[PDB]
């Protein structure tokens, strides 16, 4: 239908956790959702935000599609607009302007949250496409 | 039965102000549009420039399907190629660099026109899909 087999749907969008694909850094995880004509998720709202971490696992950290191009200059993989009033830093971050890729993760009692990491950690990643 | 309920024909494409909400950033704008399985308006003509501006409310702005993805680079959300000698520009825009986003608005006695501003802002909002 809307969604390729085992891709979710949320909005306008298809969003798959690559279960198999082991750990990798951002740029890999970025290369393989494009194998899968998909990018690294790119979340505009608080919807969204629950949605993915709704299908996520609360032991595990997840690549987001968010980069830092300059000194703290975030930008979605599909350079749609980055809204600093809508986003989902867990406190503390961002942390370090060497850490320029963007992780999800549950903190215990808290909930999940944004993280700036290293871009070569290697993380789980959630990829997202449009429907038909 | 060319366009669904509510929508309003010009040539190949079905055109529609949303209502269910009322006005909204860029972002949440565009996800709105796709849900309904459209985009915002993209505009490659003088025709639809003023089809488009004529089912407006002349007192309101709307964000269409333009956006900077760089410095200065326009993008339409179609992936359609960007044409400066085919645009709508108000006289002194785009303005400037922090202007990410952009809008069509009535200025009394010149008339419609395109005008960059903040993605942030909330505005009204055009719709655009293929025909039936
Ligand atoms: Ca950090
Ligand atoms: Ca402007």
Same mark, same amino acid.
Request: glycine letters at 8%.
């Given at each position: 239908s809307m969604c390729p087999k085992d891709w979710k749907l949320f909005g306008s969008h298809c969003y798959l956790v690559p279960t198999v694909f082991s750990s990798a850094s951002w740029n890999k995880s970025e290369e393989n959702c494009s194998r899968m004509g998909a990018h690294l998720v790119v979340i505009h709202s608080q919807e969204e935000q629950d949605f993915i971490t709704?299908? %996520?696992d609360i032991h595990a950290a997840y690549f987001i599609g968010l980069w830092d191009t300059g000194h703290r200059?975030?930008?979605?993989?599909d350079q749609t607009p980055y809204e600093e009033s809508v986003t989902f830093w867990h406190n503390g971050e961002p942390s370090?302007?060497?850490?320029?890729?963007?992780?999800?993760?549950?903190?215990?009692?808290?909930?999940?949250?944004?993280?700036?990491?290293?871009?070569? %950690?290697?993380?789980?990643?959630?990829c997202q496409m449009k429907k038909i």
């Open positions: 709704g299908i %996520l200059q975030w930008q979605w993989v370090s302007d060497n850490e320029k890729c963007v992780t999800v993760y549950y903190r215990r009692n808290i909930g999940w949250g944004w993280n700036d990491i290293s871009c070569n %950690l290697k993380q789980k990643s959630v």
